[PDB]
């Protein structure tokens, strides 16, 4: 799924096929380096892209004075009353008006969607 | 000609009193606006 880099010239490793043993190999074409491919998968395509936004959500967003905050929904980790909420804030997010909450109070940074 | 010269008798105008409704009507309009705001808030929360 990801991209692996060479350790000699630090170029990109492309998938190669080991004919003699029948195992997936990652061979850089800048040099002769070849390495064993652990994941055995090359490419993954989520065209419907059911991606989670909280992995793209940063904790310092809770410091924004322009964002609304409610004490209704508390933090799961630290149980703090006040939490800032906002929508997807992302394009190509299909049709989603759901709420992504970020817990306030310093060093918590917890986030959750409901 | 004849209608303008008759309006010379009756007269026509527009004024502040022509642009205000009864206090009951104002209360009804405010109640309708409040109900609309409550309904749209409920819709926003339901979509949330
Ligand atoms: Zn290389
Ligand atoms: Zn918290």
UniProtKB/Swiss-Prot annotation, chain A:
Output the GO biological process annotations, alphabetical, semicolon-separated: maintenance of transcriptional fidelity during transcription elongation by RNA polymerase II; transcription by RNA polymerase II; transcription initiation at RNA polymerase II promoter; transcription-coupled nucleotide-excision repair
Q: Spell out the subcellular localization from the entry.
A: Nucleus, Nucleolus
Instruction: Name the residues that bind Zn(2+) 2.
Output: 75, 78, 103, 108
In residue numbers, where are the TFIIS-type zinc fingers? 71-113
Q: Where does Zn(2+) 1 bind?
A: 6, 9, 28, 31
From what superkingdom does this record's organism come?
Answer: Eukaryota
**What CDD domains does this protein's entry cite?**
Zn-ribbon_RPB9 (cd10508)
Which keywords does UniProt give here? Acetylation, DNA-directed RNA polymerase, Metal-binding, Nucleus, Transcription, Zinc, Zinc-finger
Q: Which GO terms describe its molecular function?
A: DNA-directed RNA polymerase activity; nucleic acid binding; zinc ion binding
Among Gene3D superfamilies, the record links this protein to: 2.20.25.10
Positions of C4-type zinc fingers: 6-31
Per the record, GO CC terms?
nucleolus; nucleoplasm; nucleus; RNA polymerase II, core complex
Q: What does this gene product do?
A: Core component of RNA polymerase II (Pol II), a DNA-dependent RNA polymerase which synthesizes mRNA precursors and many functional non-coding RNAs using the four ribonucleoside triphosphates as substrates. Pol II is the central component of the basal RNA polymerase II transcription machinery. It is composed of mobile elements that move relative to each other. POLR2I/RPB9 is part of the upper jaw surrounding the central large cleft and thought to grab the incoming DNA template.
Subunit structure and binding partners: Component of the RNA polymerase II (Pol II) core complex consisting of 12 subunits: a ten-subunit catalytic core composed of POLR2A/RPB1, POLR2B/RPB2, POLR2C/RPB3, POLR2I/RPB9, POLR2J/RPB11, POLR2E/RPABC1, POLR2F/RPABC2, POLR2H/RPABC3, POLR2K/RPABC4 and POLR2L/RPABC5 and a mobile stalk composed of two subunits POLR2D/RPB4 and POLR2G/RPB7, protruding from the core and functioning primarily in transcription initiation. Part of Pol II(G) complex, in which Pol II core associates with an additional subunit POLR2M; unlike conventional Pol II, Pol II(G) functions as a transcriptional repressor.
**Family recorded in the similarity comment:** Belongs to the archaeal RpoM/eukaryotic RPA12/RPB9/RPC11 RNA polymerase family.
- Name under which the protein is recorded: DNA-directed RNA polymerase II subunit RPB9
Q: Which organism is it from?
A: Homo sapiens (Human)
Swiss-Prot record, chain B:
Modifications the protein undergoes after translation, according to the UniProt entry: The tandem heptapeptide repeats in the C-terminal domain (CTD) can be highly phosphorylated. The phosphorylation activates Pol II. Phosphorylation occurs mainly at residues 'Ser-2' and 'Ser-5' of the heptapeptide repeat and is mediated, at least, by CDK7 and CDK9. POLR2A associated with DNA is specifically phosphorylated at 'Ser-5' of the CTD by CDK7, promoting transcription initiation by triggering dissociation from DNA. Phosphorylated at 'Ser-2', Ser-5' and 'Ser-7' of the CTD by CDK9 (P-TEFb complex), promoting transcription elongation. Among tandem heptapeptide repeats of the C-terminal domain (CTD) some do not match the Y-S-P-T-S-P-S consensus, the seventh serine residue 'Ser-7' being replaced by a lysine. 'Lys-7' in these non-consensus heptapeptide repeats can be alternatively acetylated, methylated and dimethylated. EP300 is one of the enzyme able to acetylate 'Lys-7'. Acetylation at 'Lys-7' of non-consensus heptapeptide repeats is associated with 'Ser-2' phosphorylation and active transcription. Regulates initiation or early elongation steps of transcription specially for inducible genes.
Record's subcellular location: Nucleus; Cytoplasm; Chromosome
The record's subunit annotation is:
Component of the RNA polymerase II (Pol II) core complex consisting of 12 subunits: a ten-subunit catalytic core composed of POLR2A/RPB1, POLR2B/RPB2, POLR2C/RPB3, POLR2I/RPB9, POLR2J/RPB11, POLR2E/RPABC1, POLR2F/RPABC2, POLR2H/RPABC3, POLR2K/RPABC4 and POLR2L/RPABC5 and a mobile stalk composed of two subunits POLR2D/RPB4 and POLR2G/RPB7, protruding from the core and functioning primarily in transcription initiation. Part of Pol II(G) complex, in which Pol II core associates with an additional subunit POLR2M; unlike conventional Pol II, Pol II(G) functions as a transcriptional repressor. (Microbial infection) Interacts with herpes simplex virus 1 protein ICP22; this interaction causes loss of CTD 'Ser-2' phosphorylation from Pol II engaged in transcription.
Domain observations: The C-terminal domain (CTD) serves as a platform for assembly of factors that regulate transcription initiation, elongation, termination and mRNA processing. The trigger loop allows entry of NTPs into the active site, switching between an open and closed state with each NTP addition cycle.
Similarity comment text for this entry: Belongs to the RNA polymerase beta' chain family.
Under which name does UniProt file this protein? DNA-directed RNA polymerase II subunit RPB1
Q: Could you read off the lineage of the organism from its UniProt record? A: Eukaryota, Metazoa, Chordata, Craniata, Vertebrata
């Amino acid at each position: 799924v990801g991209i692996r880099f060479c350790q000699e010239c630090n170029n990109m490793l492309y998938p190669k096929e080991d004919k003699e043993n029948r195992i997936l190999l990652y061979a850089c074409r800048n040099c002769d380096y070849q390495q064993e491919a652990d994941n055995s998968c090359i490419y993954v395509n989520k065209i419907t892209h059911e991606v989670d936004e909280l992995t793209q959500i940063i904790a310092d967003v809770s410091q924004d004075p322009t964002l609304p905050r409610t004490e209704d929904h508390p933090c799961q980790k630290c149980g703090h009353k006040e939490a800032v909420f906002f929508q997807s804030h992302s394009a190509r997010a299909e049709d989603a008006m759901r709420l992504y909450y970020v817990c306030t109070a310093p060093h918590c940074g917890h986030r959750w969607t409901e | 000609t004849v209608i303008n010269n008759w309006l010379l008798i009756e007269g026509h105008t527009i004024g502040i009193g022509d642009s205000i409704a009864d206090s009951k009507t104002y209360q009804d309009i405010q109640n309708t606006i409040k109900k609309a705001k409550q309904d749209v808030i409920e819709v926003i929360e339901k979509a949330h």
